Symmetry: C3
Subunit: 317 residues, 3 copies
């Protein structure tokens, strides 16, 4: 099918952590950018308008651009940049399946490293693995890092000289992240993305993960892990069988990453919360103001298309 | 079987490197903490007494806690922490096999990053791989990093603003590590652990490694490597066929990791020393004061239980 | 067959990036060092002369040194170092196949980290994989990092306290790298090496890579990837089918690595350029002074032995 989307690039401010507000260039004014969910073989058209003060592009990471290299999104290689106020249209066939993503390809150390210019692109295979058919909950986790010294200043950041002192999943740092709520018998697909410049060792308490896909393509030899290393650019898809009720933390095991501005706890932490487990008064997330779509799991059920999410939206000036 | 162990947490000082003594929170007053070795299916009970000034927990990494999530050891999530002076009992069924480990889950960036709050938990499958059948020597290597500026003061450390300037295997930096002594024909199982916050590229000279397990679970498709990347949390099990007599160094290949306080050589370095090879006058470890249990290989032959090692104890 | 050659170690200066000249210890005065290409089973003899002011060795990474451990190149473990002005002969059998490499093993944090003391050692297997038989272009990519503060300062560098602020493939930072020129239907073997102290996430636009070898040995279960993480000491071999004409950049996806001295773009970046794709006036490499052997692809076609490359030579 032909699927056409209109995307903008906006200057907004997002709250990454308690006391850390961050200026970003959000696709449709949010970080992570909108979920794009299409079927293998769809023809995709994306009309992009740059409502910011600086040039950008969009690169479609994992998309082969078969006969369509001029839509690859690389400035000075496949196009000139999309200047401030201008528009540009990308066209590609989604013939590469799996967990893909998209991100700016201008000034990437800064724009992708700390300005949140990225989002997920899910291409459903016409022939999914048998296990994929058992899945009852699909979860996106996009990890990145932040340099507080340049939070308020576009044009700086993302160099070896800077210090990454805050860490996140889907642009929030614990406790501002959200739990992953399941019930016994759920079959959970988690898609990990190394969206930023850091390496993240994602560990699930209480469960092993069956690693089934690397960069969106199914492994001939899947393997179990309790800790999956995710590095910039990569994706891993795993399956968790939710057959062990409890409250089980799920987090980046890199020790300095579970900090926020030098304080702990913080960083890419969630909790696998099973519905049947009674809540203790001392539980850190008792009475959490809950977002069921923090990992795009509700959007991923809503059919093909492009989905914004207000829990990811930042504030305009 | 039901296996019941008593553990303490103690404030002790350990020698990590020449030039670097470090204040740690040692399980049973040692770093690495004691080896816990049990069989698939055993019911484990661990009574913990906190003889330190700060709160802690113990999380059993890789243990599913099937029906026992309140023993998972996560403060504010599965329990309130064990306060200074207090005690707490963990109970779980060891139904997950393989190379597991245990560590504090309070203030993890500091307590696991630089205060030595970790140790190995080995669960023997009732049914081991055929490959494991041939093994004649079992070896534990737990890698971690240290920040000299906070060595004497609990309550600081483990952040991106700190500088990790010393590196170790089993809490020693070369030359204070120990050789891995083997004889021709040995079949050596090595279990690597990313116990601290760094990444370690473990490279064996003279030999390829067969990578057989990831996070303690056997791979359907094992593969050979001469360099295995180990990151925080992870474990890799490999097999080395000791069929190539010589002196073969075995070390982290991350270049800045083979330093100590800015000086080379240092860091996670050992030597595979084969029996019978003549020792040259200039050999760095000629006349080494040798500890045959530096990699827990003696303890690992002693059956199920909790094993302290005096070579790992700190001072009060 | 017996393969004997002569290597020297020279103090020279290379250009890593616009504005960054770097003092290195180049094998045969070049960085990457010379390509050594032999067949499985060959007997290799390397006569080394140190024409620098400091001691070095050469370690043959991946080479088992079966019955020849005294040629392993490790100072204080397998030999005394090769002092300034002296010579040393290495002898070994190339019985381990695939993508191997060689590097100094003295002061490695500096000498390998920032002084360019490394090169590729390719051992052709008697029984290549079928896909290897289809290869039309063989490509070596050795990644490393540079600390501009010590560019002029032998004896300094490669510690946690230093700052790696330039990044390269084959000792050049974009735009001083070279394009990977292919034609439609080419079958491209690329060998990635973690030669320096950094981690590199190598991403190919427009194409998936089939990962076929880890540290030079063939995987029983190869797998596709669009991003391959390469860490110090490791090698990965991949295959790209060149079936999608265009201009497709190919680079380290670690965000800070595509900088040069804090400026962007720079670092380990190349472009897969297909023959016959029309060239826009804004294409960054439209006027490139092309070196067809920047990835040793020509040398790799010229027989068994040691190959220098004038494009990698430094200035005395
Ligand atoms: Cl439930
Ligand atoms: Cu941008
Ligand atoms: Cu990308
Ligand atoms: Cu890409
Ligand atoms: Cu944890
Ligand atoms: Cu603790
Ligand atoms: Cu853990
Ligand atoms: Cu855990
Ligand atoms: Cu070595
Ligand atoms: Cu040297
Ligand atoms: Cu090496
Ligand atoms: Cu080696
Ligand atoms: Cu790219």
């Amino acid at each position: 099918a032909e699927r056409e989307f209109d995307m903008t690039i906006e200057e907004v401010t997002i709250k990454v952590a308690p006391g850390l507000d961050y200026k970003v260039f959000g696709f449709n004014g949010q970080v992570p950018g909108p979920l794009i969910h299409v079927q293998e073989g769809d023809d995709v058209i994306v009309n992009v308008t740059n409502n910011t003060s600086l040039p950008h592009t969009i690169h479609w990471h994992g998309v082969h651009q078969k006969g369509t290299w001029r839509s690859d999104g690389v400035p000075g290689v496949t196009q000139q940049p999309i200047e401030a106020g201008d528009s540009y249209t990308y066209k590609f066939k989604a013939d590469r399946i799996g967990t893909l993503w998209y991100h700016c390809h201008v000034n990437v150390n800064e724009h992708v490293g700390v300005r949140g210019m990225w989002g997920p692109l899910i291409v459903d295979p016409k022939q999914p693995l048998p296990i994929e058919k058992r899945v009852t909950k699909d979860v996106i986790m996009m990890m990145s890092t932040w340099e507080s010294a340049v939070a308020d200043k576009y044009g700086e950041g993302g160099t070896p000289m800077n210090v990454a002192d805050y860490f996140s999943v889907n642009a929030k740092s614990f406790p501002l992240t959200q739990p992953l709520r399941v019930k016994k018998g759920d079959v959970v697909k988690i898609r990990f993305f190394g969206a930023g410049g850091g390496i993240h060792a994602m560990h699930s308490h209480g469960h092993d993960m069956l690693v089934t896909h690397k960069d969106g393509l199914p492994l001939d030899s899947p393997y179990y892990a309790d800790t999956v290393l995710v590095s910039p650019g990569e994706r891993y898809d795993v399956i968790i069988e939710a057959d062990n009720p409890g409250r089980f933390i799920f987090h980046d095991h890199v020790d300095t990453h579970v900090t926020a501005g030098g304080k702990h706890p913080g960083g890419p932490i969630t909790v696998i919360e099973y519905d049947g487990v009674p809540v203790d008064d001392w539980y850190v997330w008792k009475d959490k103001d809950y977002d069921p779509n923090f990992f795009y799991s509700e959007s991923l059920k809503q059919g093909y298309g492009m989905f914004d999410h207000d829990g990811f939206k930042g504030e305009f000036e």
